[PDB]
């Protein structure tokens, strides 16, 4: 009874994928390798708000099986994959999430993760865009104080995090998953630049190569967008408004342009930008018959939607839909602007996210464990984990790492062990 | 008299390359354009010694618009142009280089630059590599009272920077401009994408399409000589002892390998590791004959020259030998294990090397007129001029910025005129 998922049925399905992906998650099963005898977590009470994929599922029972008690909600209406919520929810772990929510439903789901049978209350929570931090900051303060922290996933709930922060909002640590390397630099890129194409083919079958492709932000989600259009034979145009990294894609060889003024000669646009109404209504307007438009950033504010409620809305097929100006032309929009990836495909496959979400399992016992040796202030874990993360990643791909001699370690100045880098390297 | 090149009559040939330079150079003619009038560098002394090519020509020249009086020495005996060198010495500015220089000339060309006429001293360092740095620590200590601070530009010599000050030898403030976004993620990396497979063509002429190529380290030189060859048709290898570099090149799709394992399957080998040793002489007995063998980290030691003194050594031409091993077998070895973009060819084009000295030119500004606002530590300058070195190369590429509204701004918590990241972005 404690759960709310589309078709329990669904169970088997869900649970042959989950299978799979453990064979593609190498850093989630060497984590319960190592610590599901010790239960590090054990007496975690874990609220998390994050898409449930089948890679969420695998995450959520490495917390288990660490000890951790959970409860689970998605952090967007169309990103939940009903075959691993109903997983779950057959093991008896309490999940409230399907795909295609409405927005009262969506916020009933995560009130759901705060209050559990018995008096359920979390300590701890994971986050995915902010949502939940928000929630509990704004609505639910008491629980703030038995709160030893926040795990936060992507780029935006970061910068919401830093927005609370410097106005003395901020009331639990919070430790920013974005940006451990083997996050940023491998979910955010490599992640977005398959499953970006993904949501695209499945939404449209559009043909990639000959088209003219706008990517609207040239950050990690933006770089790797534009890397997958283009190897598909795809003119890619980029658009940016930080002049370092519209520097770096014009040295990778796109055309760094503005939306004002190339909005008539694009086929196909992505919204990566994190910001909002970078994509306004005479933007669309302009655009040509059939011109594709889709947002991947973690919001559908990249995209002026209400500007659309206008016009007439003729379905396609679910999350793929025609608004008609006008004068007769029309554009698809993909998921009502929501991030495509999720909303039309299955987001980024398990290998990349094993990376991701290692990183949160050990920011979740980092913050259980240590959360009193923290302030309410956003953190980032130490070099060697993210090190360790890549390390559990090397084997399943075939890379064999050389080791440094101790002549080689003193003569760049590291230890053999690690860490390799200074702080404030780039990767 | 105050010079020393090798031929002075080449200086109008240098002259009509230094003019070509200015135009694809717009960073550094910014800065004059910008300051050539108030000479913030008047009164500067600067004491050099870094590549005399065509490229550190504008940057010399840039200093002195600016008021600044310099003595050049360049920083490894193969990378001078000569005919840089005599359009500078021509101007009457001291330079002290030429290609083809013995070990003591090389050190002779350093001290010439800490000693001018009529008591002639350096009140700044501008060094690449760290050998001038070590130089007046080392053997001019009542020198190193007057230096007000260095600027860096690579990343051995920071390496040797933090070393230093690490065990409280750093005695003057330093500026790392290798760690400027607008340095490391544009000349380390789609420099040496151009500059290391102009060096093995000069040199060899070698094919690249189909060869077993191997590059050792994955750090932004070793990613730019991964794509560079890659592009061109061959299957890339590569060597590190970073778990994060080694999960970054693997989901390039380059296998991950040791040079231990693979010495008798490859083709080409490169050294980008900055480290000591990584080709030691077992691994190039076992290359295959006519292997070619290069290093394109700053130091030669890089690959153990040493270990091949036993064996007869035969000139192909200039910077190109052949080393014949007992059973006969060949390895083509490049610029004696010196830079081999710089040795064999010229270093990185203009373009990418006005973002470098930029950089450089700001740092000497922040140097003379705030050294006393810094410690006897390694700084970076501020984002802000990171970001100005960007926008003053986007003009000369066609690149248009994207300008964020109001809202925008604040939606993402930044100013529309910049900073737009925070200080840990990777980019
Ligand atoms: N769908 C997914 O699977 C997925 C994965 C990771 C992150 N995301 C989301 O993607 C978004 C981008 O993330 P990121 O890590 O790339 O962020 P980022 O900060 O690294 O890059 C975003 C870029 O947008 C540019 N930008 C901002 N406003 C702009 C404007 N008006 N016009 C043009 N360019 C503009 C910035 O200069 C910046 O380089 C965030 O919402 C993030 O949470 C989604
Ligand atoms: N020739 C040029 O024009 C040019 C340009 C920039 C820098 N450089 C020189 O290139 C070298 C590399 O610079 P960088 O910025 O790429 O450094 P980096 O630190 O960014 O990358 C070097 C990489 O080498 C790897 N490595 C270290 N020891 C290794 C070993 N034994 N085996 C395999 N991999 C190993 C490290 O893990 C690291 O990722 C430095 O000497 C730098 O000064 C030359
Ligand atoms: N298959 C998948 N399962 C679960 C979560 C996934 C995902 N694919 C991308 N995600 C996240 C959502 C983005 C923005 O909210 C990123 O931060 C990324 O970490
Ligand atoms: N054409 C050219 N002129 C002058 C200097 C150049 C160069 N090409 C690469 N360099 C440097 C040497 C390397 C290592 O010493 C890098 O740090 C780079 O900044």
Known sequence: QDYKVAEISLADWGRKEIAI??????????????????????????????????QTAVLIETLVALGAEVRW???????????????????????????????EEYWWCVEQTLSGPNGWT???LLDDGGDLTQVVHQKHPKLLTAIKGVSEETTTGVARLYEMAKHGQLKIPAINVNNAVTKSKFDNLYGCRESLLDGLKRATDVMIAGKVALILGYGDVGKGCAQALRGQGATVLVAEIDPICALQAAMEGYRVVTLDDVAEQVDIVVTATGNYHVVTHDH?????????????????????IQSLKQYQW?????????????????????????????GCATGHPSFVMSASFTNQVLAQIELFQNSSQYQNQVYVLPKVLDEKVARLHLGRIGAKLTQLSNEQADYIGVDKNGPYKPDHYRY
Chains 1, 2 share one sequence.
């Open 21 to 54: 992906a453990e064979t593609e998650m190498p850093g989630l099963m060497a984590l319960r390798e190592e610590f599901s005898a010790k239960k590090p977590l054990q007496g975690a009470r874990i609220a998390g708000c994050l898409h449930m994929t089948i």
């Open 73 to 103: 909600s998605s952090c967007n209406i169309f990103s939940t994959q009903d075959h691993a919520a109903s997983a779950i929810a057959a093991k008896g772990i309490p999940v409230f999430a399907w795909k295609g929510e409405t927005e």
């Open 122 to 124: 979390p300590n701890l």
């Open 284 to 304: 669309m307007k302009r655009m040509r018959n059939q011109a594709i438009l889709c947002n991947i950033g973690h919001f559908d504010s990249e995209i002026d």
């Open 314 to 342: 003729e379905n396609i097929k679910p999350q793929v839909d025609h608004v008609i100006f006008p004068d007769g032309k029309r554009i698809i929009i993909l998921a009502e602007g929501r991030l495509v990836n999720l």
